[PDB]
Amino acid sequence: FDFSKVVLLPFTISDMDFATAPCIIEALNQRLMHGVFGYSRWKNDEFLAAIAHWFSTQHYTAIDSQTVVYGPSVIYMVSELIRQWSETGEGVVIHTPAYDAFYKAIEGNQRTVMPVALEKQADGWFCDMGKLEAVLAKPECKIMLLCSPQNPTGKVWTCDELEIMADLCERHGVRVISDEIHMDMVWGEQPHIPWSNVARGDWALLTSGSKSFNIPALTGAYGIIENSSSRDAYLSALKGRDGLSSPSVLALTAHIAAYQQGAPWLDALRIYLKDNLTYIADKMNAAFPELNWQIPQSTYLAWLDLRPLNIDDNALQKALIEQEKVAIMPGYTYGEEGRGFVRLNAGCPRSKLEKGVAGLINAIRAVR
Amino acid sequence: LLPFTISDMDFATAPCIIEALNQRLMHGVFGYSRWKNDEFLAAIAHWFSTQHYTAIDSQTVVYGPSVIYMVSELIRQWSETGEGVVIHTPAYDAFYKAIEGNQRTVMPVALEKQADGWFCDMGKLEAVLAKPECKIMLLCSPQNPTGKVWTCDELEIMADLCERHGVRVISDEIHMDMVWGEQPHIPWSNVARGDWALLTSGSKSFNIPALTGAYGIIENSSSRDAYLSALKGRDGLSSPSVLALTAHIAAYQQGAPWLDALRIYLKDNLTYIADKMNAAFPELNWQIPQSTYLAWLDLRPLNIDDNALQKALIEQEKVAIMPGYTYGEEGRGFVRLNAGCPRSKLEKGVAGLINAIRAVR
Ligand SMILES: *Cc1c(COP(=O)(O)O)cnc(C)c1O
Ligand SMILES: *Cc1c(COP(=O)(O)O)cnc(C)c1O
């Protein structure tokens, strides 16, 4: 496995520049040679068995295959559950800075987003639980959309924070939707704990292998929706109301191959990515000791805090574009929380990353 | 049991589609892709011009995960909870789901079988369209399961009645490519006015539903944009399966030769059914449908019992043929037989239908 091969220089989007695992390609090619593409069921045993297998070997978490469901995308499932677990006008809690699509999904459903900003300190990001509860205790707060691992901070929640939150939500009648699409990209010592381990009552855990193996263009996602009534409601909306029960057979095939044979490839990728993130830390801290930037606990996205440099976000952006011809997502796209940050996608060959960092460093100096 | 019960075919898709998917496959990368792809749009324009003699504006085309998803959203968009959606019955099962799933009311206008094919009584339709609460007309064109291919006349009258009574039209034309008669299929865009939608896909024509994807024309900047922000913003479905796009491009650009060979094979299959059934039961002058590879067989002239017949087919012939009563009253006395399969299979199908009809006359 070699990721040291290249298949405005851009570092702005959610996906990677790598080709997927060869075992996935070989599996798609085989399914391809069968020629027939008639209607297929997602309630496929192999698919479900592959999921169960992945959770217990990669996450040491036991799940019931019967509670799993299919979805066209993770956001579609978040959107439907929101329509299902709340009334127009009620609130959905999310930690900010947040993944852009959450706002769309929440406000698109004429629901109100209730933000709880995360705090950066000593080592890592933290959620003030008193603040979160102050918001959850609100009568109109009905759902908590939890990004775990958290994008873009890369925070990997600890067993304690998950317990506390699971507890506060049960206490105030707030259902939890856990978006864990980044579950496989963990770098630290503390492992990712699937929400199912602390889950109570009505909850959902939503994921896919699209971010891990870079196959979003195949569509498909899956999740665990608990309380069989919540699950059936979701399904009759998926199949009956919206006519989306028929899955792309290739998305299923890719996941089966990914979860059954993709471990070796995923492990090589994790190492390559972690070193890439490390490279950024070394280059940035050497040039700007004040930064004291640590690599994230998870994710191949670098949420770089530049506030210590007292640089101007727009000036910097101008220099990157016109002078360095590099495209790096300016943190202010996430509202105030991201003022003074830049997000750099490290999911790419290092030769490419080198130019992006060199670019950032030049730009920063050009405007100090 | 030998099955003849589902919407798709038993054939492998066109080889040009496979070869195109394999090629896209070898590129290895499957990152985010845009559907606002010129080739895709160009392929669609090309298909409509050279197969339906209809000119369309590529700028009005949009992508959808499935046709029903598009019908569902437009319904949420062009009506209020509780209002009515008109459909001709017998209708495709999913229409009820889509309408009632959105807590909307379905207003049926039964089609009438007579002399030669099926017809819609326009006075009856208008009686329903004039209703204050009727806001949309879901038009299946060609119509499933009757196979009716509406005439350039009927599309004028209905387009007219709908404009007159403020009723928006959604035209589901997913069967557009499977036309057998002399009268060709007329895309709704040719008589369209104001706010309307034409929804299709190549999934039924090339048998690639397992690839997902569909596309359509939504008219009036407003409705189109509203649909798009719901697709991308609210439901997070704007990212398409790159393979569905690839399949369509290859289908519309090189699939003609394959589609033509299929049309002929299917038409003869339908014909085979007519010959075998009419020879055994002259007490029914069944004509092959104007479109579709589905046989909507009227057995009422035999005064047979739907359930008894069904019992004989299952236990005695071990053949599975969709009983028409699944479509409510309109389908009482009918059976739908999918002719989209190898004839060797069809033979053992029509055969089992006979040993069943006779077993219970
Ligand atoms: C990439 C990503 C998703 C994926 O959404 P799709 O609709 O399945 O592309 C969801 N959540 C987060 C937090 C992501 O970063
Ligand atoms: C098969 C069929 C469809 C296709 O629906 P999908 O949701 O795209 O599978 C739509 N309409 C009719 C009338 C059909 O027969």
Coil, strand or helix at B351: helix
Is B169 exposed, middle or buried (CB count within 10 Å of its CB: 0-12, 13-18, 19+)?
buried
How many residue contacts between A and B have a Cβ separation below 8 Å?
160
Give the H or E element holding residue A175.
Answer: strand A175-179
Min Cα separation A168/chain B (Å): 28
Task: State if residue A215 touches ligand 1 by the CB under 6 angstroms criterion.
Answer: no
Tokens encoding A132:
């979160």
Look at residue A129 and give its three-state secondary structure: helix
Q: Give the Å distance between the CA of A73 and the centre of ligand 1.
A: 8
Candidate of A157, A181, A185 to mutate for ligand 1, largest count of ligand atoms within 8 Å of Cβ: A181
The reply to whether omega before B65 is within 30° of 0 (cis) is: no
Q: Please tell me the distance from the alpha carbon of residue B167 to that of residue B84, in angstroms, as a whole number.
A: 10
- Beta-strand pair A141-147/A91-96: parallel
Of B25, B26, B209, the CB nearest to A38: B209
Distance CA B126, CA A297 (A): 65
Of the candidates B73, B154, B82, the one whose C-alpha atom is nearest the C-alpha of residue B119 is B154
Interface mutation target, options B8, B24, B30, B102, chain A, most CBs of A under 10 Å: B30
Three-state DSSP state, B65: coil
Contacts of B108 (CB under 8 A, 6+ apart): B86, B87, B88, B89, B91
CATH number of the domain located at residue range(s) B13-255 in this protein: 3.40.640.10
The burial of B112, by beta-carbon neighbours within 10 Å (0-12 exposed, 13-18 middle, 19 or more buried), is given as exposed
Retrieve residue B168's tokens.
């928006």
What CA dihedral angle connects B57, B59, B63 and B69, to 10 degrees? -70
Cβ neighbours around A213 below 10 Å, total: 26
- HSE, side-chain direction, 13 A CA sphere, residue B299: 29
Q: What fold, for A1-19+263-367?
A: Aspartate Aminotransferase, domain 1 (3.90.1150)
Pocket of ligand 2 (CB under 6 A): A 243, 246; B 7, 66-68, 92, 140, 144, 172, 174, 201, 203-204, 209, 214
DSSP label of A192: P
DSSP symbols for A315-336: HHHHIIIIII-EE-EEGGGG-G
**Lookup: tokens for B191:** 């008589």
- Please tell me the distance from the alpha carbon of residue B87 to that of residue B137, in angstroms, as a whole number: 6
Exposed e or buried b per residue across B238-254, where buried means at least 16 C-beta atoms within 10 angstroms of its C-beta: bbbbbbbbbbbbbbbeb
Indicate the residue of A29, A40, A105 with minimum beta-carbon distance to B22.
A29
Rounded to whole angstroms, the Cα distance separating A213 from A206 reads 16
Q: How was this structure determined?
A: X-ray
CA distance A153 to A211: 16
For chain B, where do the domains classified as CATH 3.40.640.10 start and end?
13-255
d(CA B189, CA B194): 11
Longest dimension (CA), chain B: 61
Phi, psi of B51 (to 5 degrees): -130, -20
- Residue A198 burial (10 A CB sphere; 0-12, 13-18, 19+): buried
Q: What's B291's DSSP letter?
A: B
> CB–CB of A179/A146 below 8 Å?
yes
Chain B interface, best mutation among A47, A80, A241, by max B CB count within 10 A: A241
Residue contact B241–A247, C-beta within 8 A: no
Count CB-CB contacts under 10 A for residue A238. Answer: 20
Give the chain A residue whose CA is nearest to the CA of B231: A76
Residue B105: phi, psi to the nearest 5?
-100, 130
CATH of domain B1-12+256-361: 3.90.1150.10
- Cβ neighbours of residue A27 closer than 8 Å, sequence gap 6 or more: A253, A254, A256, A257, A261
Q: Nearest to residue B252, comparing CAs of B205, B210, B284, B297?
A: B205
Q: How far apart are the first and last CA of chain A?
A: 41
From the CB of residue A103, how many other CB atoms can be counted at a distance below 10 Å?
18
Q: What are the strands, taking DSSP E only, across B173-256? A: 196-200, 214-218
CA atoms within 13 A on the CB side of B56: 30
Question: In chain A, which residue's Cα lies nearest the Cα of B242?
Answer: A217
Q: How far apart are CA B85 and CA B104, in angstroms?
A: 7
Tokens of B169: 């039209």
Greatest Cα pair distance, chain A, in angstroms, is 61
* Nearest chain A Cα distance for residue B29, angstroms: 4
Residue with structure tokens 């490290």? A346
CA atoms A282, A288, A292, A298: torsion sign:
negative
Can you tell me the distance from the alpha carbon of A255 to that of A47, in angstroms, rounded to the nearest whole number? 7
Nearest 5°: CA angle at B273, between B271 and B274? 65
CATH of A20-262, one of 3.30.70.270, 3.40.640.10, 3.40.50.880, 1.10.540.10: 3.40.640.10
Q: Please give the Cα distance from B327 to A84 (Å, whole number).
A: 30
CA B285 / ligand 1 centre spacing (Å) = 57
Task: Let me know: does B334 contact B298? Beta carbons within 8 Å.
Answer: yes
Comparing CA positions, the residue from B92, B90, B151, B107 lying closest to residue B298 is B90
Nearest by CB to A214, from B31, B102, B235: name it.
B31
Chain B interface test: which of A219, A252, A253 (most B C-beta within 10 Å): A219
Tell me which chain A residues have a C-beta less than 8 angstroms from the C-beta of B241: 217-219, 248, 250-251
For chain B, report the end-to-end CA distance as a whole number of angstroms: 23
A214 Cβ below 6 A of ligand 1: no
Q: Which of B8, B101, B239 sits opposite A39 (nearest CB)?
A: B8
| A27-65 b/e (C-beta count within 10 Å ≥ 16 → b) | bbeebbeeebbbebebebeebbebbbebbeebbebebee
> According to the 3-state scheme, what is the secondary structure of B159-187?
HHHHHHCCCEEEEECCCCCCECCCCCCCC
Q: Give the integer Cα–Cα distance in Å for A363 and A322.
A: 10
Structure tokens, B188: 């709704």
Domain with CATH 3.40.640.10 in chain A: 20-262
Residue B67 CA to ligand 2 center (angstroms) comes to 6
Q: Where in chain B is the domain with CATH 3.90.1150.10?
A: 1-12+256-361
Tokens found for residue A8 = 């405005």
Supply the residue whose CA is at minimum distance from atom 2 of ligand 1: A181
Return the structure tokens found at A26.
Answer: 């070989």
CB B64 within 8 A of CB B215: yes
> Would you list the DSSP string of A41-103?
-S--HHHHHHHHHHHHHHS-----GGGEEEES-HHHHHHHHHHHHS-TT-EEEEEES--THHH
User: Between chains, do B69 and A243 touch, taking CB under 8 Å as contact?
Assistant: yes
Question: Which of B12, B29, B236 is facing A35, going by the closest CB pair?
Answer: B12
